[PDB]
Design an enzyme around this catalytic site. Sequence first.
Site, PDB file in Angstrom:
ATOM      1  N   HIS A 123      -6.076 -27.927  -9.554  1.00 63.13           N
ATOM      2  CA  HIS A 123      -6.384 -26.365  -9.597  1.00 63.13           C
ATOM      3  C   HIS A 123      -7.534 -25.897 -10.658  1.00 63.13           C
ATOM      4  O   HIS A 123      -7.900 -24.951 -10.490  1.00 63.13           O
ATOM      5  CB  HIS A 123      -4.932 -25.655  -9.781  1.00 63.13           C
ATOM      6  CG  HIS A 123      -4.687 -25.323 -11.191  1.00 63.13           C
ATOM      7  ND1 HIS A 123      -3.363 -26.144 -11.808  1.00 63.13           N
ATOM      8  CD2 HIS A 123      -4.924 -24.420 -12.108  1.00 63.13           C
ATOM      9  CE1 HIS A 123      -3.430 -25.677 -13.004  1.00 63.13           C
ATOM     10  NE2 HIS A 123      -4.152 -24.882 -13.537  1.00 63.13           N
TER      11      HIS A 123
ATOM     12  N   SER B   5      -4.159 -25.715 -18.642  1.00 60.08           N
ATOM     13  CA  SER B   5      -4.361 -26.214 -17.276  1.00 60.08           C
ATOM     14  C   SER B   5      -5.063 -27.378 -17.277  1.00 60.08           C
ATOM     15  O   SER B   5      -6.104 -27.616 -17.683  1.00 60.08           O
ATOM     16  CB  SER B   5      -4.918 -25.340 -16.055  1.00 60.08           C
ATOM     17  OG  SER B   5      -4.469 -24.181 -15.777  1.00 60.08           O
ATOM     18  N   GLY B   6      -4.169 -28.641 -16.746  1.00 56.84           N
ATOM     19  CA  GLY B   6      -5.189 -29.889 -16.580  1.00 56.84           C
ATOM     20  C   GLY B   6      -4.828 -30.702 -17.746  1.00 56.84           C
ATOM     21  O   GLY B   6      -5.124 -31.960 -17.524  1.00 56.84           O
TER      22      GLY B   6
ATOM     23  N   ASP C 238      -0.857 -31.591  -7.693  1.00 56.56           N
ATOM     24  CA  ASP C 238      -1.759 -30.918  -8.658  1.00 56.56           C
ATOM     25  C   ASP C 238      -2.481 -31.800  -9.925  1.00 56.56           C
ATOM     26  O   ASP C 238      -1.924 -31.678 -10.769  1.00 56.56           O
ATOM     27  CB  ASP C 238      -1.020 -29.758  -9.235  1.00 56.56           C
ATOM     28  CG  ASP C 238      -1.924 -28.735 -10.041  1.00 56.56           C
ATOM     29  OD1 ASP C 238      -3.327 -28.847  -9.805  1.00 56.56           O
ATOM     30  OD2 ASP C 238      -1.572 -27.818 -10.873  1.00 56.56           O
TER      31      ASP C 238
ATOM     32  N   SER D  47       3.208 -24.023 -22.766  1.00 56.66           N
ATOM     33  CA  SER D  47       1.622 -23.931 -22.249  1.00 56.66           C
ATOM     34  C   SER D  47       1.463 -22.924 -21.603  1.00 56.66           C
ATOM     35  O   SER D  47       2.135 -21.879 -21.265  1.00 56.66           O
ATOM     36  CB  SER D  47       1.214 -25.293 -21.583  1.00 56.66           C
ATOM     37  OG  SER D  47       2.181 -25.515 -20.156  1.00 56.66           O
TER      38      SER D  47
ATOM     39  N   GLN E 151      -2.374 -20.058 -19.684  1.00 56.62           N
ATOM     40  CA  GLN E 151      -3.573 -20.303 -19.154  1.00 56.62           C
ATOM     41  C   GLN E 151      -4.557 -20.864 -20.322  1.00 56.62           C
ATOM     42  O   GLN E 151      -4.486 -20.533 -21.384  1.00 56.62           O
ATOM     43  CB  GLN E 151      -3.984 -18.767 -18.718  1.00 56.62           C
ATOM     44  CG  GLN E 151      -3.564 -18.093 -17.552  1.00 56.62           C
ATOM     45  CD  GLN E 151      -2.074 -18.102 -17.082  1.00 56.62           C
ATOM     46  OE1 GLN E 151      -1.413 -17.719 -18.062  1.00 56.62           O
ATOM     47  NE2 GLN E 151      -1.909 -18.191 -16.003  1.00 56.62           N
ATOM     48  N   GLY E 152      -5.486 -21.507 -19.547  1.00 57.82           N
ATOM     49  CA  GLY E 152      -6.495 -22.515 -20.466  1.00 57.82           C
ATOM     50  C   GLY E 152      -5.882 -23.859 -20.674  1.00 57.82           C
ATOM     51  O   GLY E 152      -6.765 -24.598 -21.291  1.00 57.82           O
TER      52      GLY E 152
HETATM   53  N1  LIG Z   1       3.891 -21.048 -18.165  1.00 62.55           N
HETATM   54  C1  LIG Z   1       3.044 -22.339 -17.916  1.00 62.55           C
HETATM   55  N2  LIG Z   1       3.631 -23.287 -18.548  1.00 62.55           N
HETATM   56  N3  LIG Z   1       1.644 -22.171 -17.513  1.00 62.55           N
HETATM   57  C2  LIG Z   1       1.030 -23.169 -17.891  1.00 62.55           C
HETATM   58  C3  LIG Z   1      -0.209 -23.302 -16.780  1.00 62.55           C
HETATM   59  C4  LIG Z   1      -0.716 -21.866 -16.557  1.00 62.55           C
HETATM   60  C5  LIG Z   1      -1.994 -21.901 -15.529  1.00 62.55           C
HETATM   61  N4  LIG Z   1      -1.629 -22.409 -14.233  1.00 62.55           N
HETATM   62  C6  LIG Z   1      -1.640 -21.340 -13.334  1.00 62.55           C
HETATM   63  O1  LIG Z   1      -1.643 -20.197 -13.432  1.00 62.55           O
HETATM   64  C7  LIG Z   1      -1.298 -21.727 -11.860  1.00 62.55           C
HETATM   65  C8  LIG Z   1      -2.507 -21.846 -11.004  1.00 62.55           C
HETATM   66  C9  LIG Z   1      -2.173 -21.081  -9.922  1.00 62.55           C
HETATM   67  C10 LIG Z   1      -1.113 -20.239 -10.078  1.00 62.55           C
HETATM   68  N5  LIG Z   1      -0.404 -20.595 -11.047  1.00 62.55           N
HETATM   69  C11 LIG Z   1       0.843 -20.118 -11.661  1.00 62.55           C
HETATM   70  O2  LIG Z   1       1.084 -20.757 -12.706  1.00 62.55           O
HETATM   71  C12 LIG Z   1       1.512 -19.167 -11.076  1.00 62.55           C
HETATM   72  N6  LIG Z   1       2.166 -17.955 -12.037  1.00 62.55           N
HETATM   73  C13 LIG Z   1       2.672 -19.575 -10.232  1.00 62.55           C
HETATM   74  C14 LIG Z   1       2.200 -20.438  -9.109  1.00 62.55           C
HETATM   75  C15 LIG Z   1       1.491 -19.911  -7.756  1.00 62.55           C
HETATM   76  C16 LIG Z   1       1.484 -20.546  -6.828  1.00 62.55           C
HETATM   77  C17 LIG Z   1       1.758 -21.756  -6.856  1.00 62.55           C
HETATM   78  C18 LIG Z   1       2.251 -22.409  -7.584  1.00 62.55           C
HETATM   79  C19 LIG Z   1       2.795 -21.823  -8.738  1.00 62.55           C
HETATM   80  C20 LIG Z   1       0.405 -20.911 -16.033  1.00 62.55           C
HETATM   81  C21 LIG Z   1       1.482 -20.974 -17.096  1.00 62.55           C
END
Ligand SMILES: N=C(N)N1CCC(CNC(=O)[C@@H]2CCCN2C(=O)[C@H](N)Cc2ccccc2)CC1
Length: 223
Positions: free
Chosen positions: A40, A177-178, A84, A172, A174-175
């Site tokens: 993503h 990711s990965g 992912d 974790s 936003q930001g």
């Molecule tokens: N709490 C955390 N540990 N994380 C850490 C990672 C981050 C960043 N990753 C995203 O924002 C991903 C990218 C695409 C949407 N998505 C989501 O997480 C959506 N909320 C839920 C979802 C939607 C569709 C398919 C699968 C899940 C989010 C928070």
Amino acid sequence: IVGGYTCGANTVPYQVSLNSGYHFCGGSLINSQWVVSAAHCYKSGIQVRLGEDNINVVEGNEQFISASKSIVHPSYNSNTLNNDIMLIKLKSAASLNSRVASISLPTSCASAGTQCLISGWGNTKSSGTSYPDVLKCLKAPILSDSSCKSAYPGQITSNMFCAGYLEGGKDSCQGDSGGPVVCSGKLQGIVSWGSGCAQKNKPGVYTKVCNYVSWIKQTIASN
Ligand SMILES: N=C(N)N1CCC(CNC(=O)[C@@H]2CCCN2C(=O)[C@H](N)Cc2ccccc2)CC1
Ligand SMILES: [Ca+2]
């Protein structure tokens, strides 16, 4: 990272920042010319920034290397985030040293209850937004599959695991990711998704790297 701590400069030497004129994702160096990140996070124009601590100040130890290739898993589904994972090849090899170092891939999957290190430059607030200068770290356990599916019914595939906390406040975000989830010296997870950040009953969900080791090695060998 919400509820974490300042790692300390270059104490996570495999952590990279993916930059497109701003930090947008993390990643993990797995050899001198390849990074593992989340599918993503794919976009054109990726610059990989190695050796970073303060991502807003040139401190020394940085290596900035353009991506030459980004390879998203062919079975990545952006609606479910199954598979992912993405590989990024660097245009030139990084110079490896104590501050820029690869992380080993798993030889077997990790077990529930194993404590892992999750790191990144993502949001540090569970409500609102604050992005840090320096790298943040969080110690977090892998949850049982059953707890993970209870938290996210119908959403957890065999290529995902949950890690973190159910009481809120540590996750974790936003930001991040990965970026890496490292357990016993092995890259077992990639920061993938969750509902909000650090919300009660909603742990982080991570790509299960141990399912991809053979795919990683073959993809590198062919590229
Ligand atoms: N709490 C955390 N540990 N994380 C850490 C990672 C981050 C960043 N990753 C995203 O924002 C991903 C990218 C695409 C949407 N998505 C989501 O997480 C959506 N909320 C839920 C979802 C939607 C569709 C398919 C699968 C899940 C989010 C928070
Ligand atoms: Ca810097």
